[PDB]
Amino acid sequence: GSSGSSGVFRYSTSLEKHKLFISGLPFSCTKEELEEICKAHGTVKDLRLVTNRAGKPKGLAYVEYENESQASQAVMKMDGMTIKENIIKVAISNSGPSSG
Numbered sequence: 001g002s003s004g005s006s007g008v009f010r011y012s013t014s015l016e017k018h019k020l021f022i023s024g025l026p027f028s029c030t031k032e033e034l035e036e037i038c039k040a041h042g043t044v045k046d047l048r049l050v051t052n053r054a055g056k057p058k059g060l061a062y063v064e065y066e067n068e069s070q071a072s073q074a075v076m077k078m079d080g081m082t083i084k085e086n087i088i089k090v091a092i093s094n095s096g097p098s099s100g
Contacts, residue, residue, distance in 0.1 A: 012099050018045075018071050019093035020063040022078060026086040027057045038063055041077065042070025062093065 022034075031049055038044045043066035050060035065071040071092070079090040 013097050016093055016096060018065050018068055020065070020071055020075055020078075021091045021093040022061045022063070022088055023059055023091070024086065024088045025057065025059045025061055026084045027059070028084050029057065029061075034061060034063070037078075038065075038074060041065075041074035042067060 031047060034049075035044060035047055038047060044064070045066050046064035048062045048064075050058045050062065052058055063071070063074070065074070075090045075092060078088070081088055081090075
């Protein structure tokens with residue numbers, strides 16, 4: 001939807017921005033790896049890897065930073081980066097609670 005700068009109201013639950021979303025990652029990739037690489041940009045509040053019912057990496061991975069500027073930088077770099085011979089894409093975890 002649009003974004004009205006002038007004045008702010010409550011329409012949809014608080015949205016998250018700091019969080020980051022990374023898709024297209026090689027199963028080989030491991031948390032630690034992404035962790036060390038994440039802390040390279042800023043403070044890593046928390047890191048989680050979307051696994052399957054069997055515990056297999058679905059390729060998706062979520063990240064949590066302390067500030068906003070930090071995450072942004074990591075997104076500008078990680079966005080379209082090669083990892084273990086695999087081009088991974090990044091995206092600011094904005095979409096979450098499906099309103100309707």
